[PDB]
Amino acid sequence: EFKKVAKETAITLQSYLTYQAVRLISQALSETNPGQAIWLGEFSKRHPIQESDLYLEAMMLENKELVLRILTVRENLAEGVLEFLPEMVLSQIKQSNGNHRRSLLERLTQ
Amino acid sequence: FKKVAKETAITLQSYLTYQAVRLISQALSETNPGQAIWLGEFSKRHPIQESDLYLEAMMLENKELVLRILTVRENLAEGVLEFLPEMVLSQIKQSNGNHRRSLLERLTQ
């Protein structure tokens, strides 16, 4: 029952999947149309993918076709990845937690 | 879809840690301002986006806080992870529609 945190994490996740889409598409383009990939690279320097909506809106001024392609790719990733995440993250934290704990307590002894 | 899932899972891990620290600091600033102010200074010196290093770093300075972060992040992790796929997937669809409509309008305008 921490909504503020759920909200901010969801929003973060949204932008991250957006970035994750741009990553895939960038690789694709680095093969197919290099000149366009160079553009995408430097575009992403001028605009933080962290504000994905501001990023996408900004892109509309330059390459509408890509925006659309991003919107699609991002949603597919979302479908493919989202459901596996809770189990995945929870046990990662658990394992990480254990290792830090056992490590920190060993330092006290040693 | 596997590589993405792992990278996302790591980020989310890293992120929830941050989010924990944040929540802890909010309380610390209400309670032990000296500690909170130190926490601030520390965060600047060590990048939270690197939790595992960020934590090991802090193990050399405030073991008691490290252990608290670990407990706190896991509480959030359990309270939040579950409602995440519905929220994000829905949130994307919604942003997706707006963006499409906006864009397709601009095209003819």
Swiss-Prot record, chain B:
The keyword Signal does not apply. Changing residue 68 to A: No longer assembles RbcL8, no active RuBisCO formed. An RbcL-specific chaperone. Required for assembly of the RbcL8 core, acting downstream of the major chaperonin (GroEL-GroES). Acts on newly folded RbcL, has a transient dynamic interaction with RbcL and is eventually displaced by RbcS. The central cleft of the RbcX homodimer (RbcX2) binds the C-terminus of an RbcL monomer, stabilizing the C-terminus and probably preventing its reassociation with chaperonin GroEL-ES. At the same time the peripheral region of RbcX2 binds a second RbcL monomer, bridging the RbcL homodimers in the correct orientation. Belongs to the RbcX family. The chain holds residues 3 to 111 of 134 of the full protein. This is RuBisCO chaperone RbcX. Changing residue 18 to A/L: Assembles about 50% RbcL8. Homodimer (RbcX2). Interacts with the exposed C-terminal peptide of RbcL ('Glu-459-Asp-468'); binds 2 RbcL peptides per RbcX2, stapling them into an RbcL2 dimer. A slightly longer peptide binds with a higher affinity, but no long-term stable interaction with RbcL is detected. Contacts a second RbcL monomer via its peripheral polar surface. GO terms for cellular component: carboxysome; cytoplasm. It comes from Picosynechococcus sp. (strain ATCC 27264 / PCC 7002 / PR-6) (Agmenellum quadruplicatum). One of its GO terms (molecular function) is protein homodimerization activity.
